[PDB]
Write an enzyme that holds these catalytic residues in place. Structure first.
Site, PDB file in Angstrom:
ATOM      1  N   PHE A 142       1.940  10.523   1.501  1.00 34.28           N
ATOM      2  CA  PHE A 142       1.557  10.094   2.835  1.00 34.28           C
ATOM      3  C   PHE A 142       2.597   9.079   3.311  1.00 34.28           C
ATOM      4  O   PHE A 142       3.470   9.407   4.131  1.00 34.28           O
ATOM      5  CB  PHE A 142       0.147   9.487   2.731  1.00 34.28           C
ATOM      6  N   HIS A 144       0.771   5.361  16.864  1.00 35.73           N
ATOM      7  CA  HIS A 144       1.696   4.489  16.158  1.00 35.73           C
ATOM      8  C   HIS A 144       3.085   4.796  16.703  1.00 35.73           C
ATOM      9  O   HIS A 144       3.496   5.971  16.828  1.00 35.73           O
ATOM     10  CB  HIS A 144       1.653   4.746  14.644  1.00 35.73           C
ATOM     11  N   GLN A 200       3.683   1.416   2.865  1.00 35.59           N
ATOM     12  CA  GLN A 200       3.413   0.448   3.926  1.00 35.59           C
ATOM     13  C   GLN A 200       3.845  -0.953   3.462  1.00 35.59           C
ATOM     14  O   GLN A 200       3.536  -1.361   2.331  1.00 35.59           O
ATOM     15  CB  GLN A 200       1.932   0.404   4.238  1.00 35.59           C
ATOM     16  N   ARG A 211       0.871  -1.168   0.000  1.00 36.09           N
ATOM     17  CA  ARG A 211       0.000   0.000   0.000  1.00 36.09           C
ATOM     18  C   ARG A 211       0.909   1.219   0.000  1.00 36.09           C
ATOM     19  O   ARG A 211       1.753   1.390   0.885  1.00 36.09           O
ATOM     20  CB  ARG A 211      -0.866  -0.085   1.254  1.00 36.09           C
ATOM     21  N   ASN A 234      -0.770  -0.937  12.845  1.00 36.38           N
ATOM     22  CA  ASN A 234      -1.387  -1.748  13.914  1.00 36.38           C
ATOM     23  C   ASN A 234      -2.880  -1.809  13.712  1.00 36.38           C
ATOM     24  O   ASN A 234      -3.387  -1.380  12.674  1.00 36.38           O
ATOM     25  CB  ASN A 234      -1.106  -1.169  15.311  1.00 36.38           C
ATOM     26  N   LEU A 249      -1.015  10.726  13.638  1.00 33.35           N
ATOM     27  CA  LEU A 249      -0.725   9.337  14.046  1.00 33.35           C
ATOM     28  C   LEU A 249       0.056   9.356  15.328  1.00 33.35           C
ATOM     29  O   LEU A 249       0.306   8.304  15.924  1.00 33.35           O
ATOM     30  CB  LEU A 249       0.031   8.645  12.875  1.00 33.35           C
ATOM     31  N   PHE A 291       5.386   1.389   8.252  1.00 33.31           N
ATOM     32  CA  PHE A 291       5.302   2.314   7.116  1.00 33.31           C
ATOM     33  C   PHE A 291       6.415   3.352   7.216  1.00 33.31           C
ATOM     34  O   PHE A 291       6.961   3.656   8.280  1.00 33.31           O
ATOM     35  CB  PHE A 291       3.919   2.972   7.086  1.00 33.31           C
TER      36      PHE A 291
END
Lengths: 165, 11
Positions: free
Chosen positions: A60, A126, A63, A55, A102, A122, A113
């Site tokens: 951004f 994370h 991942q 992904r 997660n 985040l 990521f």
């Protein structure tokens, strides 16, 4: 004590792109850094080599880390399937931060990521455990194959990985 | 939206 450096060699549909190396902050998050380091050498008998970035959303993050199902639903830690959020001392401050994916509090596995922008939303959710040390230009090159919904147009894989220091 | 989850990926 020196923090470990690990590397990934990235390939795009089997063609080598280049090497990205990472510094892991074992001095701040020892357990999370260890988990990523051992999955990069494959020393427990399983790890990131041959797995893909499933992904990628341009601007951004990229991942990856699902070496069991290969599709975004699997992977596991070296401690069992999942482990706790070690701490949230570090923040997602800019391009190059390495953080854990997660599915809520204390569900860390192997998926991770690499941020290509500051993602402050985040923070506290994370665990940040490393940063790109060299090869940020290869991460930028990887973004070109992603899309707003995350599907990549080419197969992006970790052709090889290991620890340098 | 912009999350990084494992299992149910949201918007």
């Amino acid at each position: 004590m020196v923090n470990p450096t690990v590397f990934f060699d990235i390939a795009v549909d089997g063609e080598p792109l280049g090497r990205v190396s990472f510094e892991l902050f074992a001095d701040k998050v020892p357990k999370t850094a260890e988990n990523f380091r051992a999955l990069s050498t494959g020393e427990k008998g399983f790890g990131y080599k041959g797995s893909c970035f499933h992904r990628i959303i341009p601007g951004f993050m990229c991942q990856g880390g699902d070496f069991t199902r290969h599709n975004g639903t699997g992977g596991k830690s070296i401690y069992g399937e999942k482990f706790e959020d070690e701490n949230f001392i570090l923040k997602h401050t800019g391009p190059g931060i390495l953080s854990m994916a997660n599915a809520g509090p204390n569900t860390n596995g192997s998926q991770f990521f690499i941020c290509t922008a500051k993602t402050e939303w985040l923070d506290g959710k994370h665990v940040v455990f490393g940063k790109v040390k060299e090869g940020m230009n290869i991460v930028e090159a990887m973004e070109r194959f992603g899309s707003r919904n995350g599907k990549t147009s080419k197969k992006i894989t970790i052709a090889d990985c290991g620890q340098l220091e | 939206x912009l999350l990084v989850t494992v299992g149910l990926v949201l918007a």
